[PDB]
Amino acid sequence: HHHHKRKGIILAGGSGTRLHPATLAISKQLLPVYDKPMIYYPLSTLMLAGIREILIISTPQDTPRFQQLLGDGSNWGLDLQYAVQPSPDGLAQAFLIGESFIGNDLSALVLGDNLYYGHDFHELLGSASQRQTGASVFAYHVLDPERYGVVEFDQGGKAISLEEKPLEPKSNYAVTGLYFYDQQVVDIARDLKPSPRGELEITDVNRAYLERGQLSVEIMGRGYAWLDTGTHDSLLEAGQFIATLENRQGLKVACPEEIAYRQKWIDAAQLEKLAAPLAKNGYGQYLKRLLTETVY
Amino acid sequence: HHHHKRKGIILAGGSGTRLHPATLAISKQLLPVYDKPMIYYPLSTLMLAGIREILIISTPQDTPRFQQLLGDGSNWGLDLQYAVQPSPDGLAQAFLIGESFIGNDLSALVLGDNLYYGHDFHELLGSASQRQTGASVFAYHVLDPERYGVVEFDQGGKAISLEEKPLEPKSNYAVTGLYFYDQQVVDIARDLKPSPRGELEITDVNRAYLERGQLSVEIMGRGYAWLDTGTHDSLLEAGQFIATLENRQGLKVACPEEIAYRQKWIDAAQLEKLAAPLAKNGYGQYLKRLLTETVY
Amino acid sequence: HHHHKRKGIILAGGSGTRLHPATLAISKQLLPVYDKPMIYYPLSTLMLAGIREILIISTPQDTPRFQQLLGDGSNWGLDLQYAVQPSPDGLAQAFLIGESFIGNDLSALVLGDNLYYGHDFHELLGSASQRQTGASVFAYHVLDPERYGVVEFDQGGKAISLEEKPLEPKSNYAVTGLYFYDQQVVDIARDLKPSPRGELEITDVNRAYLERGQLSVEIMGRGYAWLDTGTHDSLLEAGQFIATLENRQGLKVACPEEIAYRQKWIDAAQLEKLAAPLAKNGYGQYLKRLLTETVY
Amino acid sequence: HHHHKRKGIILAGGSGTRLHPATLAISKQLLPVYDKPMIYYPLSTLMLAGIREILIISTPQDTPRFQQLLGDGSNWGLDLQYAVQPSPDGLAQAFLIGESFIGNDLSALVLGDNLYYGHDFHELLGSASQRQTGASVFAYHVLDPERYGVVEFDQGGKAISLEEKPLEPKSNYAVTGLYFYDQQVVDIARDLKPSPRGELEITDVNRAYLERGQLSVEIMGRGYAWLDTGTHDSLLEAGQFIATLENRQGLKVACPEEIAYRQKWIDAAQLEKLAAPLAKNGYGQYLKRLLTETVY
């Protein structure tokens, strides 16, 4: 136990009224994507990147529920802490809210409703996580880049501009909801002004690194799935996508107890205890099977 | 001493740990089925039976959230009351919990995780609602009767036995989660002894009515969909099913605002106000279109 | 000189290049919807109307394949004939191609890519089939009327105009792909002039009947599913929709063997033989179960 | 044009009666998976492995249809040839049928109903394709390894046995439907005897390489999708899986014209011509867009 290198933040704050009435009772990032709470996925992304000290930011109403779901992290070899965003005034506000949590360390922000799947994903993040200066982002080809921060490249494949929700996007490349930053991000976030939309823009954070030549924009290839959670239709597809992978394989995607176990943050003895409450359903069954099966 | 309509109950309590970890932060009946919380579907079903006075039974933990979503019903021409079920002791327990709520009235119990769709469904509920003594249930042909209460019929089509979760079902006709009762149900329920599963069984209730010759079983035809919400798989399918119908039709299934509007429990002016806070999203836009479209 | 029942047509011709490359090797109406060829669904629809004598219209290239699948109908208590449509010149062309087949009889046209599901669907088809003069069509509320023939109603609910693919639909009520005709349709069809699209339009046919006051439009309610097969997306959804119903119920939608059995066009002994060559798979096992289960 | 290094074979032969009636009219590998014929996927796998000379083996009935779909290959920079398997007497029969096509060259067999997706898939195949001696296979963790050829590993992660459809599988690792072989496979196939099931087993081919220490079994990781096409349910999931990837990305999976174009087997001028017939639908639109868009 802990009373209060790279730190993680999950920004799991309010989506406004766009998925109401589904999200009227509870924020989106506590709803299941197939067999597990949405937040398990970005949590799992951070743990895959090797990050164990992690701040979860949510609305004032829902922190108790996040706190309840995940606890202090210790049962999974994590050190979790919690903070609140009172209004949805931009994703960069994560760096103001998390300022004292970050301290003097390196950091990474993941959106709490972002789903990543694919091969060698541990290596793709460990590469960004090892770059100790500047920021690292990921660009992914999408059909509807107007909804996102859009990267423009020159003919030699070098990032030359970023634009948030452009009316005429410059490419089909969109910045995904996963960001790695050095010790400069907090101080860049403090200097931000609200945009025409009344938000502290993460795209402004990232343009400040671009303007200094310190932004690494790596291509996240078509062979990776960055799954859309923005619409009722896209939530549905995501659960369909995860279910098809888990049913085919008899292996789970973004099972935090398993990831902990593979990183050796918990031992056999602890995994076994975590299997015990859930032993009557499939998820406890999965976790027990992992004790005696070799999975390459 | 000397003496001189039908209330509804929705049971939306603990699904224990069945669907953990998806349901760890929030109870099943608030998870979305496509674009609206699951509890809207059975609420709509009672509304369609003509029932305006309704008791929602939930866990102590989740009652506030049902209340936040649903309020007192006044916005939709209903009256909603709340009660808690501290321990999931079985479905027949709704009648003890709801004894003061029911009083000397007729009742209807609906499971808070049961979705229905189909044609003349209003009329099928009308005929059970207007049967003023005894009980009515609905029998539906399912692939896996062993999971349900099962009705055995004789060669005349008459109901002759009921068995809860039989290993060797006598038919494929499962009893759906919607039950209509006369003034005898509370007394029947008080006398029940817990099953060996540690549960007060709705099927024991229906058997009492059967043994007194006061149980109408109606067939809910194959042209109706009675959807499965028991697993992560079936839940996903339930969302796909609704999405497909609403995207095809430009009409919603189980939109409580709409149903109150068509029942004339609320007027055009009242519906316009309900639309306003959701005007940016599709749900609010749909409520608005209903004002100026004849829909047959 | 001196003179003294209803045939069906299924149009399963060229979808041109719309769904190429999926449909390059094989026509649309033979692609599966879940577990059975698409053409089974509209065939089943005619069977449900009581119609036993049926002409299948396909491309010259694909007729052998319809014939290999369906034969002459004798196995299922029907009589199937075949005709070809060398150029996709429009739906009303079915009446010229099928003129000798129809003779002096009543008719019914069904599109070979149109799926229907719902309750009392038998009865809804019964009332159109038994209307012996004029034409009957069905109007269904859709999200995208602009893609269909659209019915405009006056405030009494009476059909007053029909428009093919209007840019500004007068209602959301599209005319479904199922049409019932008296002995005037062939003559109406011979007189049509091609539309500017180079097509003989079914909607022109229905307008002739409207202008003579002999067009019944019945509403196919929202409790019916009329499924979309026009796109790769909608097709996939159509398979998901059927799969969900059949997996839930342990019953099939549009199983022609079953429907002949229940119509008493074939007997138990005949159905047992049809089951045999499919006995290893689920379809054959289902046919076998139908012999020894009462299904209401 | 060509009249009749590594060669490819696609075995797209009969699945018997297990998907009847869906497959009664046409073999499975000509049915669409979402927007394209199933065979496009394994074709695309071979082209991704750098293989351009390719033999397509099908039933006698369906060769004309495969021939019709794909032609001589020349429009896509391939050299296709066709041959027939008269009865389904085992996957190893591909090497007897293809003996003279193979000649003295290296070879690779892909099953015509196998779908692969994932990142760095070009590199994973180019590694197997470069190993000039022995055979290379892939092992993938699945839920139901009894259906497949199953690999057993020792504690150091070395393949020590292969078993075809074991009643008690030794691991959850299954051999996928993609095989690379040197000049020995033809002569090993000729010496095979039929199994207890009356088939020339590909697993026997691969055990012969294992017994000689010449089988490379590489793990295909959980971050890759090997999609199941064996059941109606699994076909459906696959089309759902592909559609979700293509709709999110605005990029296609296994578009052979695109792969050809990226390998430089056809130029801009040719791609443009292939866009022309399909210009009115999305797939022609996709191909034209590829002329003027840089996709990393």
Ligand SMILES: CN(c1c(N)n(Cc2ccccc2Br)c(=O)[nH]c1=O)S(=O)(=O)c1ccccc1
């Ligand atoms: C399918 N993936 C996955 C894995 N690859 N792994 C393997 C794993 C686990 C711990 C450390 C490295 C690796 Br590789 C795992 O244990 N769980 C997984 O869900 S993943 O890398 O694409 C992924 C991990 C976490 C969140 C989202 C996807």
Ligand SMILES: CN(c1c(N)n(Cc2ccccc2Br)c(=O)[nH]c1=O)S(=O)(=O)c1ccccc1
């Ligand atoms: C699709 N259905 C439906 C309707 N039929 N209706 C029409 C309606 C509304 C009020 C009273 C009668 C009728 Br009919 C509606 O307004 N909303 C609906 O969702 S239903 O009858 O099958 C249904 C009602 C309530 C919950 C689930 C399905």
Ligand SMILES: CN(c1c(N)n(Cc2ccccc2Br)c(=O)[nH]c1=O)S(=O)(=O)c1ccccc1
């Ligand atoms: C689900 N339906 C259905 C049925 N209702 N029936 C029952 C049936 C059969 C023959 C005659 C009347 C009736 Br009811 C059946 O045997 N197979 C069916 O698929 S349906 O009436 O909506 C339908 C029939 C034909 C094609 C598509 C749907």
Ligand SMILES: CN(c1c(N)n(Cc2ccccc2Br)c(=O)[nH]c1=O)S(=O)(=O)c1ccccc1
């Ligand atoms: C999504 N994939 C994919 C690609 N990766 N590519 C990129 C590509 C194309 C040609 C040569 C190398 C690469 Br990388 C492509 O052009 N089409 C694709 O479908 S894939 O490598 O996983 C794949 C290719 C072919 C069949 C099945 C999957």
Ligand SMILES: [Cl-]
């Ligand atoms: Cl990639």
Ligand SMILES: [Cl-]
């Ligand atoms: Cl019915």
Ligand SMILES: [Cl-]
């Ligand atoms: Cl209806």
Ligand SMILES: [Cl-]
């Ligand atoms: Cl992997």
